[PDB]
Symmetry: D4
Subunit: 183 residues, 8 copies
Amino acid sequence: MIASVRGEVLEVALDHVVIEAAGVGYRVNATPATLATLRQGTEARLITAMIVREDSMTLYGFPDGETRDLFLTLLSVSGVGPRLAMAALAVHDAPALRQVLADGNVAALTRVPGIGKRGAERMVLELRDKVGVAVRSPVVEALVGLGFAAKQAEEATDTVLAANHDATTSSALRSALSLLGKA
Amino acid sequence: MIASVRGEVLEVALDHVVIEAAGVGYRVNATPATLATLRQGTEARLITAMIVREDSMTLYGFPDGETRDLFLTLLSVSGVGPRLAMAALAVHDAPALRQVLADGNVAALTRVPGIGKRGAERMVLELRDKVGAVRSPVVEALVGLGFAAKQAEEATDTVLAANHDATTSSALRSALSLLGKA
Amino acid sequence: MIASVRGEVLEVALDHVVIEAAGVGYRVNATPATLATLRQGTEARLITAMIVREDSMTLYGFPDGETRDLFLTLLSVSGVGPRLAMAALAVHDAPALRQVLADGNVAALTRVPGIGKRGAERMVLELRDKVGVAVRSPVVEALVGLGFAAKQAEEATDTVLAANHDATTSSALRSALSLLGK
Amino acid sequence: MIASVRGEVLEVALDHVVIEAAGVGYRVNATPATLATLRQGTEARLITAMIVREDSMTLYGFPDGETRDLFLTLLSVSGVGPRLAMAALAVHDAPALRQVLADGNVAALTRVPGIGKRGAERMVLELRDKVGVAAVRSPVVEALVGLGFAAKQAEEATDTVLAANHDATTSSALRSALSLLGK
Amino acid sequence: MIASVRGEVLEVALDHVVIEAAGVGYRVNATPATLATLRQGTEARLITAMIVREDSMTLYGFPDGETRDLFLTLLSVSGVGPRLAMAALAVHDAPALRQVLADGNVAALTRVPGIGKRGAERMVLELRDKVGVAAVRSPVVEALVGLGFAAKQAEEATDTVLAANHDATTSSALRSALSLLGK
Amino acid sequence: MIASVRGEVLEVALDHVVIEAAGVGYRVNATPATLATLRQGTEARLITAMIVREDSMTLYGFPDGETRDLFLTLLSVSGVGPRLAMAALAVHDAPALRQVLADGNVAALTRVPGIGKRGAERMVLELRDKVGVAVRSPVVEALVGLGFAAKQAEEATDTVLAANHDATTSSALRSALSLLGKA
Amino acid sequence: MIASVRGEVLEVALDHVVIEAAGVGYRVNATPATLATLRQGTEARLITAMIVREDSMTLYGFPDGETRDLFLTLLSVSGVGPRLAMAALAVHDAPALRQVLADGNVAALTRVPGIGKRGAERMVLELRDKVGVAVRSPVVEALVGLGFAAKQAEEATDTVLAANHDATTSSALRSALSLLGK
Amino acid sequence: MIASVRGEVLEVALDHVVIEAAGVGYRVNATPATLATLRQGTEARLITAMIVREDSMTLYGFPDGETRDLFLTLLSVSGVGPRLAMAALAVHDAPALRQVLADGNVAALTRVPGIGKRGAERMVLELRDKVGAVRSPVVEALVGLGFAAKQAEEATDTVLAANHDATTSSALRSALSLLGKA
């Protein structure tokens, strides 16, 4: 629910920061890297990921949305929870971590405390082609997200994009839907 | 609990928006149609439906209360959760979705990914009527408190007959004192 | 956790109001009576009781803590949830309802939809000795509140009230605590 | 998630207060002592600890994070919950409480209502060598341990960084140690 | 599900026994009194009440179903669980317990450990007009009510059947009343 | 798990029976109709349906498996639990209940206490073509049950049945699988 | 609920045995020591502890109640589950383990995989006063067991033991109960 | 808990069997291959895997322990539950399924309804090795108690060197006393 928190940095710890928004101070966990860029008494905005469990409600912040998204993705792998996800990133910056996950670098992953030889392999297997392996593609992802079949979702997207090129990613989606909604 | 969010649109994505209110940016999920009327770096407000679950708290936003209510009404149907409720709405605007249901159009609904012939019929069955001036609202509020329609009506008529031009709320509390009677 | 909501009234329905506090509009379920005193586009505050459940997070507003408290109390009774509780309060104001309870007027309680025969007796039995009837009394209940007995929560308090001529109920409490600790 | 609330004090009670931040009045539980320093109609800030359970979401306020942390720590003992924790802190101020715990003062703890002879002993066993009182190397190792690294390997990298970078910051030292650890 | 166990008594204890039915030794909890009548190495039968919880599956034995039913009934009172129920029945024999309850003997109940003044009162309020002691028409209506029919409609059909079938069996009367009710 | 219980009928009540198997007495809920056929002190076998919930474990018995299956089917409808299911059957024998559910007889269903106008409609809608509206069909049901697509499941079944007619329902299934397992 | 399983041994592995009781073969997890005394195709009995959890229902066998009991006891400690408990018993027989606990021999406890430094101290502290050191003592614990204090569970018992010359611990208990009830 | 059921086959259906043991008929789910070797009105025994869940307790039976274990091993894979585990086995006999996995044959597995290219690869990845004489079993039992392989081996070699022809169990307990050493 909480996608971001912007406010006065009240405290910069070694594994988190406290940002005050409208008098409310939110604790947001982060990596040294993300923290290093923060200074007490200054304003700051972090892109967060709110993770609610039965006995907890936690925020994890990052510099950008690309990174925050990467975190959420790490979470989708079996046996990889919030903490381990953060550790992976604390040990390997987003850019590297991604790289490793493409180069199937199992040696590198292992270094992250908590990731065994197998664990690393499951991570590499689960997301090598889900990190980085543009009008068109985005629109079909949107349609597949709404539950449409791929080789049909892309059929609408080509018709739309071809019938109208100047189309933005959003308008393109609206169009595809109108054709899929079968007028 | 959160019925709405008003703030600066920090980001307009393909399936949701981020609105900042008091330095807190809330992710509000929405349909492409709703998503269209929005612009980044602008002030905006979306009527929302906050769904609380064990491992999640998600917001779903719409242009008006009316639409946000139809959203919740879809959830009231067995088998239909938020994702599908949203998809149904993305494929059919509120106005149309309402007719498809009221009109019992199994074919149209089926065009929504996830809704099969059987599932479409259920929605048509359970919602057919469920899709849609002081007397009715007052008794409704009353029935909403467990009172029996008949008894609810029989106290509302009495009140509206007391004084006629009475706020719907005023007629309601007035009818309550009569029901806490003796 | 949320004790009160104060902001612009965005909508006033028959069983709830929406108060926008800092851009976020909270839905607050209230009684027609309470809802009566509220007009849209106006600033308003409401003492609330936040009910947290696995699949829900709901607010309940009232004019004062006096009523918000009774509400919470109604919920102390086995078999009584928020809907029934609000219903009860909608049929009888906090003041009166207390009377019905203290006077065990089961005939009036049953007037509330959802509360019948034994349901009322169950309530009358569970709430009488805690509905509606000084620096010393509190300070002791506060100690009894932290777990302290009474025989001892009274001696420490008497010790301090005779010690410090007579001042704040606060310092008397934290003073009785200091003794109770050594 | 909520680490602190700041706003107007709407009501000071004997076991809780109401601080109103941006229209929202949050109820935060505290000890007579913590409540003492507060005055209604005044703007005040309190370091809180948000405990979320299945049918409850509560705030517990304190004067500073140090005290707040003590509270969280009390909760780490089996059988010790929010209520008992507060009671403990209401009878013994934080300093006193840490003192007692480090000095196995079972007699003192037993005085707290609800805490018996055994409980006092478990607490003393649990908390004793774990109290922020009863400095760049240790912290950095602490964080490295926290991220999943073993004590040995952690010291090894922290020492290196410090020897190279004369003496600097826990932050930089941490970030630099993680770099080495990344192999 | 398990309503009774019958087999060799492997061990009579002070608060439970072990009856071995077909190789499986079931532990069933009971009162000193119920345990009295039992003798090790003897074949014995006990009417049980199986309480299944999330992390527990237990048996509670009694001399006859009547008593077993009383136990189940005690459990229908908010705040009253298996343990308290047993204790209640250990101090007061079933007859005595029903007596007390019907006679609002709050003094007697309060004697049971764990049951206070209030508890005794709730119990008396709850149980009192609901005790199998403190006959074909009533039962059949009882069953018809149990199946979801309202008292009025239920009597109406039961009377009919009985008037037609002079006087017969609760069974047949029930089956015949359900037929009419089926319209 | 428990599909049936055969033993000495220890007690015949108005809404259940107690059958003892190897010294263990199981309480099995049933309709008057099913009970009427039972007599105390006699042996008896009932086809049961064990329904386990977090705080309970119950058995529901019937004359045959066709009926027991009908019960399980009623359970698959939304808002229809064990009790209501039993009541439907207590009020309408299997044969009739089925009939009603085909003739969309909403009037009849309503009579069952607990089934409103809408409730009945959902039941009729959900299972009119799942009660009764043979080598071939059974084999495809088996394959669809294992997760196979219908219009492909039946394609294998025809090949098998045609290539070999004398086939039993079971052997026919084994065959289809071998062809679907793609040798 | 299942206190013991007696039947034909169908299989004897290294960490468990399968006893077929009346056609049903129950898997019973045991220690190599216990498993030692068992030979396939032979009749065997085993005192068990049935552990019921949401997604599991497991049995644990032992030679006697003495050990099955200690097992249950090990589980009374925070942080100790069935695996670790069995492991402990597999490394130290019930007798010895009791010694290690009573003598707080933390160096020996840590020999058990999964139990380290403080883990052992935690156990030593939680179990000593309940590990390994008459008609009157029991009867009183039995009353203390039903909730009775002690001051009173001792007087009623002394009253009856002096009343009835001296007989069954049973009748003494149900006799003390009869007094404690009037 | 229930490792096996032996009794009269009361019914042999298309996807399960009913075996009566002590007048209790248990529904044992099984594959068509296993289902074949069974005849009604005959005595039979199936090695089972009892899966306990909040709202269910289901039995799955097979011809041998070996096969029943492979069944549980499939469950250990993320995303694979009992239904699919059974389907996989119905489409591929234990022997073949083992090779398909060991051989990492994504194509074959994909023939199983429910197992896609991605899901097949996961199973191949997580089980590839997981599918398959006294030294190894003894250290394994030891490692099963948390002991470190190296230390486990270093105590087993010592024992097997004590006396050579020693039961695998005897070597195990013997190695344990050595590990509870000093």
